[PDB]
Amino acid sequence: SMLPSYDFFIHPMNLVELKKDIWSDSPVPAKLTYGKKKYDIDIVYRGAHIREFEKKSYHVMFYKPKKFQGAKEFHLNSEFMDPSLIRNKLSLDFFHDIGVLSPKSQHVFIKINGQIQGVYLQLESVDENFLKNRGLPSGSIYYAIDDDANFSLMSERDKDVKTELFAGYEFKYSNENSEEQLSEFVFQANALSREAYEKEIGKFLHVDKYLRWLAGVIFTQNFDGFVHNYALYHNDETNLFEVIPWDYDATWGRDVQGRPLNHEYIRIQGYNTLSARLLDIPIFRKQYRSILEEILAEQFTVSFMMPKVESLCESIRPYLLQDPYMKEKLETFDQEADMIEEYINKRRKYIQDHLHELD
Numbered sequence: 585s586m587l588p589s590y591d592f593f594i595h596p597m598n599l600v601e602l603k604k605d606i607w608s609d610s611p612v613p614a615k616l617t618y619g620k621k622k623y624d625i626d627i628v629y630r631g632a633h634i635r636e637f638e639k640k641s642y643h644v645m646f647y648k649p650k651k652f653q654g655a656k657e658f659h660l661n662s663e664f665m666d667p668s669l670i671r672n673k674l675s676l677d678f679f680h681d682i683g684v685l686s687p688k689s690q691h692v693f694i695k696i697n698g699q700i701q702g703v704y705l706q707l708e709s710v711d712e713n714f715l716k717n718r719g720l721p722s723g724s725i726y727y728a729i730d731d732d733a734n735f736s737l738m739s740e741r742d743k744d745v746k747t748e749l750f751a752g753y754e755f756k757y758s759n760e761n762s763e764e765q766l767s768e769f770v771f772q773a774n775a776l777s778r779e780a781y782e783k784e785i786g787k788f789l790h791v792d793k794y795l796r797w798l799a800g801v802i803f804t805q806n807f808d809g810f811v812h813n814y815a816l817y818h819n820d821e822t823n824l825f826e827v828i829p830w831d832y833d834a835t836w837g838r839d840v841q842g843r844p845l846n847h848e849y850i851r852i853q854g855y856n857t858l859s860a861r862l863l864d865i866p867i868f869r870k871q872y873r874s875i876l877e878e879i880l881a882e883q884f885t886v887s888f889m890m891p892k893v894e895s896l897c898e899s900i901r902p903y904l905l906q907d908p909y910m911k912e913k914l915e916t917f918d919q920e921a922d923m924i925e926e927y928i929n930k931r932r933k934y935i936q937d938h939l940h941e942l943d
C-alpha cells in the first residue's frame with residue numbers, strides 16, 4: 585500500500601508571495617512532478633483555521649496539462665486537527681457505501697522544494713468532472729458556505745425571511761437556471777403542506793438519497809453537518825436535488841476542536857427544517873428507520889468498519905514516521921483505532937435504543 589509521492593516546486597519569489605498573507609485566496613504558479621510526468625499548476629492555501637498550521641493545506645489547480653487523473657483540480661488537506669488523519673476519508677467513503685454521492689480521497693506523501701511536508705489527504709473536487717467521471721447528468725453544483733445554507737426560508741442573522749432563497753451557497757458549476765432551481769427547491773421544501781408533502785416533495789428532492797445522507801450525518805456524528813459541510817447537486821435529467829458530504833474530519837468520536845466526545849450525541853432525527861418536515865410524514869419516517877436498520881446491519885458494524893480503519897492506518901504509518909510534523913506522535917495515532925472502535929459500539933447502542941422514536 586505505497587502512497588503516491590508528489591514533488592511540488594514553488595519558485596522562491598512565488599513562495600514569498602504565498603507566505604506574505606496566508607489568508608489570501610490568490611493562487612501562485614507552481615509545478616507538480618509525479619513519477620516521470622510534470623504538470624504546470626496554480627496553488628493556494630485552502631480552508632480557514634487550517635492555514636494556521638505549519639503543515640499547510642492546499643488547493644491545487646491544473647493548468648497545463650489541463651487534467652490530472654480525470655480532474656482539473658484537487659484539494660490537499662493536512663488533516664492535522666485529526667490525530668488519526670483518517671476520519672475524513674473514513675466518513676466520505678462510508679457515505680459512498682451507504683448509497684450517497686461522495687468525494688473520493690486518497691492519502692499521498694508530498695514534498696515542496698525538496699523538503700518533505702508529510703502525509704496529506706488528496707480530496708476530489710466536487711465539480712463537473714466529479715459528475716462526468718461517474719457518468720452522471722449535467723446540472724448544477726452548489727457549495728454550502730454560510731449559515732443561510734440551512735434549508736429554511738429564514739435568515740438567522742436578519743431574523744427575517746431571506747432576501748434571496750439561494751443565499752448561502754457558492755455556485756461552483758452553474759448555468760442560467762441554477763439560481764431559480766435552487767430557490768424553487770428551498771421554497772417548496774418549506775412551503776409544501778404536511779398533507780401535500782409525500783406527493784410533491786419528490787418533484788424537487790431525491791428523498792431516498794436525502795434520507796441516506798441524513799443517516800450518514802447521524803452515524804458519523806458531524807455535529808455541524810446539517811446546515812454546513814455539504815454540496816448540493818441538481819441533476820438536470822431528473823430535475824432533483826441531492827446532498828453530497830464535504831469536510832467530515834470532526835467525526836467518529838471527536839469534535840471540531842479535536843476533543844474526544846464525552847456524553848455528547850446527535851439525536852437520530854438530525855436537524856434542519858427539511859429533515860423535520862420529512863420526518864413528519866409516516867412513510868418517510870418508516871423509510872428513514874429502514875435505512876438506519878439496514879446500515880446498522882451492513883455498514884455501521886465493527887466487523888465492517890474496523891478493517892478499513894486498520895488498513896488506512898497501516899498504509900500511512902511508515903510515512904508518518906517520515907513526516908516532520910507527525911514523527912513524534914505515532915503513539916497517539918496508534919490509539920485512535922481503539923477510540924473509533926469504542927465509538928462505533930457506543931453509537932450503535934444509542935441509535936438502536938432510539939429507533940422506536942421513528943414509529
Ligand SMILES: Nc1ncnc2c1ncn2[C@@H]1O[C@H](COP(=O)(O)O)[C@@H](O)[C@H]1O
Pocket residue numbers: 630631632709710727728729754813814815829830831
Ligand atoms: N464539495 C464541497 N462542498 C462544500 N465546500 C467545498 C467543497 N469542495 C471545496 N469546498 C470549499 O471548501 C471551502 C471551505 O473549506 P473547508 O473548511 O475545508 O470546507 C469553501 O471555500 C469551498 O469553496
Ligand SMILES: [Mg+2]
Pocket residue numbers: 631634661831
Ligand atoms: Mg477543510
Ligand SMILES: [Mg+2]
Pocket residue numbers: 645646647648650656
Ligand atoms: Mg486548469
Ligand SMILES: [Mg+2]
Pocket residue numbers: 765787788818822823824825
Ligand atoms: Mg428540479
Ligand SMILES: [Mg+2]
Pocket residue numbers: 831840
Ligand atoms: Mg471543518
Ligand SMILES: [Mg+2]
Pocket residue numbers: 860863864
Ligand atoms: Mg416532527
Ligand code: NA
Pocket residue numbers: 831
Ligand atoms: Na469551511
